[model samples]
Target: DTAVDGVFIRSLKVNCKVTSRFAHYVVTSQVVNTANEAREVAFDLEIPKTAFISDFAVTADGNAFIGDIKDKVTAWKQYRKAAISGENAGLVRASGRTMEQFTIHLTVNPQSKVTFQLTYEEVLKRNHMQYEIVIKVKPKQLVHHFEIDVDIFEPQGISKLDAQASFLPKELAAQTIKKSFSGKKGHVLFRPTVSQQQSCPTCSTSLLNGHFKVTYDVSRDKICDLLVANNHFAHFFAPQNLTNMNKNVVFVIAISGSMRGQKVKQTKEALLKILGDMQPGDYFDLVLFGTRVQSWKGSLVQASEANLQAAQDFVRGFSLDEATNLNGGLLRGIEILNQVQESLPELSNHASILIMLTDGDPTEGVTDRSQILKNVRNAIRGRFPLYNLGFGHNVDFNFLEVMSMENNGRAQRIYEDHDATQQLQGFYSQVAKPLLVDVDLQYPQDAVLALTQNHHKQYYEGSEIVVAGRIADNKQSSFKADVQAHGEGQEFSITCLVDEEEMKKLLRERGHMLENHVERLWAYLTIQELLAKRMKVDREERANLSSQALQMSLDYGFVTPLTSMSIRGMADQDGLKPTIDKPSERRTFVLSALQPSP
Candidate 1:
């Protein structure tokens, strides 16, 4: 049983901006021992100070000295009198109010029977400011060695959090909190406590909790000499083994007709290189898209021996054609995945990855591309990751980005004349080898169900975890959460401490940015559609079509129309000047005064 130590405050009062004083008080603590030998005991009281004012005095007999400036009260000599007791009090003074009436009263002790009675009064300005009164007392010399036991509590529906502790000498003291993905709640434990005097700075220790002061002793040799002992040093005390472990992944290449010729070939070669980087258990799947989608054997197939050869034969013999309907290829790949999912053992763990490669706006079949993307995302939901690959300048990168964003996936573009193989290979490695898996975010126990309304799912950025959402009436609320994950046959979880005000500010700013990004995307899409249709108009209708295009170009602040190109000639002659047939075709649209004549 933990022994009770009494610490108390009697009364406190505040009036205006500077003067304070306290009534006389007394605090007493005494120890009892049955041993015949002499016993040595020590007591130390910790005091917190403020910067706005000056001087803190603790009453010893009747003399008072400034308590805050270090080295003032180093040691206290006790003569062991028969239970000594006397009145003890403190006072304060600020700028405008002369000497203030004391308004703080507190007494603290570690392991002795004690009692205190104190009364204080003060005056301060009406401005809202933070004020704290804390008095902590501990035995001057440590008697029993005790270690901290961390217990993190989290609510449901949270994601992407991590926690860990480090000792003074940069040694890992415990396993980090693992990311959680599903279920309402979870936990992990770290044991094998250290009794050494050297301290460890756990995850939550740096937080300004207004209680204890954290100090690091830099010169401790043994504490600094520790290193990650083994890969299994992480402490996880959970029941279920991690899900989706030891899974083999195969990447499929889905390029559109716009990704024809050299670009299409490059995509395949890039995928092949990406496959080469796979560990022993990983696999590969390449699907090329054009007028018709092509796979290993003219159908979705496996990466095994005879199947791989058939895939290579298909690619080597593949050629590009018109009609780059992105939906046809993407959906076909989904169908293939469905079939594969059904074939796998119900209890077996495997992760299938789908890679979509395309470089053109979706011009065929689907009139509303957003709806199509959403459909594909739903089809592959929780089944596998759909990584989007946009090739060349012609691809609809904005659309691809939104697709990836919606699915919690990644979107990357291939630059011209660069090694597509290296880029794709690296990207594949990252996704294939997850840093943390089966992650879920847990909300605070007291919080009601709240949703993250941001379009992009939240991702961790260093030590700071940010999430975006909107609430009605602008009312503020508190949130507590944890990030949980399971991998390598072990479970893990971390507590996420969020400042309510900070979270609100981040959400508001992110909301504004998301809206702006959407606006830019819409404007770009409208311009591209106009360009595609412009080529179909007859010469007689050129002026009307060109006028609409020019107005749109100028309105969007594109570099071209604002410079050399302008609406010229009289209104009587077709009411528009002949527009440049291919403004986008030039290596450089803006005229350079120093260029040599071609």
Candidate 2:
């Protein structure tokens, strides 16, 4: 807490700028100490887990102690030496379910101030049909000034923009929150003065706490939209107007004895709502497993109103008790899908999906993690995507992630929040309607290189697929992208042509002064894919991928898990708690470690 040593925040500001979904945000805080004795001042923050810290610095007496990025293990070694000498240091680590914590503390002399500056970048993913930005606002003591500003620019124009605070009093909210969207630009500003932050005009207690979130969606067309700038190109595919494909779904739920009480009730709540969202054309089945597996109807059946009602009743009757048979449950799910595929040979226009939910590890019947993954791969043969919802932190998330990655699907964590049911239902909504399958986007190899994933097995109705690459020839007049997919009982194909002049206007008219965002997006996507590939490749190839990832992580000056950022002339870190009580030290970070200023 800032009150530890009569220290309080004087000013805090967070500025976020986003272009084409590539976000760059900066956070700055000024803390002043009033106590006669020197005391430690803290700078603590939580950010989205997938984000990368591009730069961080602690400035005191007009000197900047910059953070340096290097190998984590080796960085620890150097930090150990710095600790022996005694200094102010910073460390970063995973803090909670969805966000990571960054912490730094240093001794501030009486009547002195220290400024904490942090920089981060992340590619925002569209989930539940919107992009959300969450920032925690908890300045323990009311300050003279506090502000949060966000500027968003989307070439396609913004269709919706919303702002909210979990703890905002309607009176203060109405006076402070200002938001608007005009054409391709949107802005959200939250600047609260001292009086507004307090519970009342007479109380000194600050009411500024909890999450401040902003969610928005961009206008998009069914046709593929191409953007080219800064020698890079990205094609966004979010098609609509096509008929939704019918599908068979199997829900494999583990009700092992441990899954009881709150978790069980939450699952039931989500299941009932999930059932109501199903379409009449879809077929569905349920498999409940403890030490063994049991199917609801012995086979898959159409999701008629009657069938859904029965399933809802079954879910309500769920009471929790055993060792988990996760593999068996999943196998039974696949068997049901296979059973119907053979019985209905005449049916040609349908898709298949399998969802598995578990709160713990497998214990009974084929329990080896790797063995289960191998067996599932052999059985499905990549026919359907297997989305996984690991119910809680008790589950082996690494196992779920690898399995989902290999299966052309995704895995999500179901937090135990009171709104857990909403999360469960929201995840289901993302994939409820499959609009396209066997989707492929092709760019001319001669014109482009270093392309991201261009082949995808499935694309949901609300989801967008992005294929980015480096343009090989900036002098070329135009480029064409071909897309093909199958859905609605027929084939689909389209070509998107990029006119150089039109794109130049698109880039110039947006007032995009910071142009490196396009290039940064390319590097960000490349490193992400390399990290994913590292998990799926052999040891030798994995090492190669690891090296490439490290190179990019360093070259881009991003502090990722593969690399770390530390203050060279500063305190003990590397996840170690520094208990030093030193007063002041000359801290200097080589400012050359940053990009050249315009």
Candidate 3:
């Protein structure tokens, strides 16, 4: 037996359009059967006459009629059923225990078509699942749309419901669509406009060309929360189509020391291959730093065939010099770049790169350590970017690493015995392309723009200019920034392309390093190394340093000794283990998947 809380006619239509409306289905002939009841009975089943059929029409069998009905027989039949069964036994159950199924059939003229739509909203209080159904009917055609809203309540539990809509059009069955949509950072300020319309009540007509514009209040936390809903974060992190070409760059390579070994040779060969693939008009320089910084040729030169062959010949005959003055050699290379800027200011891009190669100790001159390195870095700060390649043991990892970070560059360690030439060549090839330059950002007045600490200098990694930053509002405002890159010495600019959808996704991903903690930590370590030579860190100073380091590890997503261990004993007893490898290794941090510890 089935117990229906309620059932009613939701909607009624005629010929593809709504003509008249029905409030509820008229109930009749309810019944309740008990033991030893075998007598016939009759009673009245009343319904508003207004809700009855309007126009009379009989079917071919004359069993069912539309509009005005012949109530004499129909009413008596309904009354007799209700009286004998207590209610509409055909529609519901009264025995509480009975195998029963009933149906209501309407027979209409084959020529006449009827259509209607129905809507039902149901709430399951026990499970907290809300279900809504929108049903459309056209003669024999029936369509149903189902929507479910999930409510999070208990920390853990499961709520399940099976939905089977019999009236849905067969062709318009269930289907799911996958989409990747992203918002931009700037959209957080000026929310995009969404338009919708309200149906017209007069004449039961649908509204047309009408819309409602909604200006989302981005200042509200709720607004930003929607940006990263679902997998929208993927769209946010993914790169965009580089609209225009901008910036031409030159790459200078330094092949020196054990660099002349197979490793260095491979590096030089790979670099040439990468350089040859550069876009036309893109300039490059290849300098090998050995006992001193020297061009691929006897002197500094461009990336021409004559110069390349000369450079190649020099590389083939190059030998490890056993001693190095990397600092002094770098300074000498900077001098050549200064000359290029003077001679070709228009063609010269902002980031001119000088990649140096070396293995073994700086056994030559001016190894005053940090001082000379600092001076060389300052000398080429804005004019040129220098990259360092350390191959084999005794190479200065700390120095190379610090140099790369401080100068918006990168340092790569080449394995001893691995072909140095291959590593160098691969690194140089990638470092030679320029995706964007002369980039500028705009902001609304009174608003502040801060680049996230995790910001990385846009580098040519295959292709793309990836910039990271955050925008804060002083009040309700809009922000627009112009980004320009120099291509062939011509300036190309465009308004910031960040969209609201993409920005929302990033926010949902909790954003990446809001602060450049790694860079800051590296800077601090570099300072410590510099001071270590002058004075020893006392107990108090060492403690403070450890605390600061631990605090940083905790604040960011990095694993720390203190946070990585779990204590399951009565006294919080647990063995401590290293959460991360010592500062001598490299690891990639993916920002999208980070989450708080349970």
Would you list the C-alpha lDDT of every candidate in the order shown?
A: 0.37, 0.79, 0.35
Q: Tell me the spans in candidate 3 whose CA falls farther than 4 Å from its real position.
A: 1-261, 271-286, 296-300, 344-346, 349-351, 417-422, 442-450, 453-485, 497-557, 560-567, 570-598
Q: Summarize candidate 3's per-residue lDDT along 248-299 as a digit string, tens digits.
A: 3333344445554566566656655665555544444545455565554322
lDDT of 2 by residue, 424-498 (tens): 988888888898988999888788867889998888977778888887765345677999989868898999887
Q: Candidate 1 deviates by what RMSD?
A: 28.1
lDDT, candidate 1, 1-598, per-residue tens: 1111222111111111110100111222323222343332222232222111222233322222222221111111111231321111112212111222222222212222222112111111111111112222232222222222211111212222233333222243323222232322222222222222213232212211112111111111111111101110001112222233444443445445556567766766865555444444544455555666665533334345665555556666666767676777777676666655566444124455667777777766663876787788788785666778776777778677767655666677776455765666655554554433455655443342223221222111111112222222323243444566555455656564444454344335333332332233233334443444444445667656556655654554332221122212211111221121111210111111132245
TM-score of 3: 0.46
TM-score of every candidate: 0.38, 0.90, 0.46
Model 2 ranges off by over 4 Å: 1-8, 34-37, 78-90, 318-321, 474-476, 510-514, 572-598
Q: Which is better, 2 or 3, measured by TM-score?
A: 2
In lDDT terms, how accurate is model 2? 0.79
Give the candidates in order of lDDT, highest first. Answer: 2, 1, 3
The alpha-carbon deviation from the true structure for residue 393 of candidate 3, after best TM-score superposition, in angstroms, is 3.9
Better of 1 and 2 by TM-score: 2
Which of the numbered candidates is closest to the native, going by highest TM-score?
2
lDDT of 2 at 596: 28
With a 3 Å backbone cut-off (N, CA, C), the pairs that clash in candidate 2 are 87-571, 88-571, 257-321, 257-322
